[PDB]
């Protein structure tokens, strides 16, 4: 057990760490923001995303 | 002279440092642990160390 106290230097103070672990998979997309969906074209070249 | 004091942050606190310096030489081995010596074979292929 560590035993950190609030009156010492930063070398013995607790820091909450969120280890973001992820992987780019074959699965359908889940979490990629509120970004605007656009229209669809079937004959013209576009910069699709 | 630094003049260190025990009531300041870690940026101004003395740290004892042991600089390990070594080199892999032709000389016979000296310091490589209590690891178990094994038997010897003269006709069979092995993974020697």
Return the structural class of chain A.
little secondary structure
**Number of E-type strands of chain A:** 0
- In terms of DSSP E residues, the strand content of chain A is under 5%
- What is the terminal-to-terminal distance of chain A? 49 Å
Rg of chain A computed from alpha carbons, rounded to a whole number of angstroms:
23 Å
Largest interface: A-B, 3 and 3 residues
Largest sheet of chain A: none
Helix content, binned percent of chain A: under 10%
| Oligomeric state of the chains present here | part of a larger assembly
Q: Name the shape of chain A in a single word.
A: rod-shaped
What's the tally of helices of chain A?
A: 0
What's this entry about, in short?
It is classed as viral protein. The structure is cut from a larger assembly and holds two copies of chain A (49 residues). By secondary structure, chain A is low in regular secondary structure.
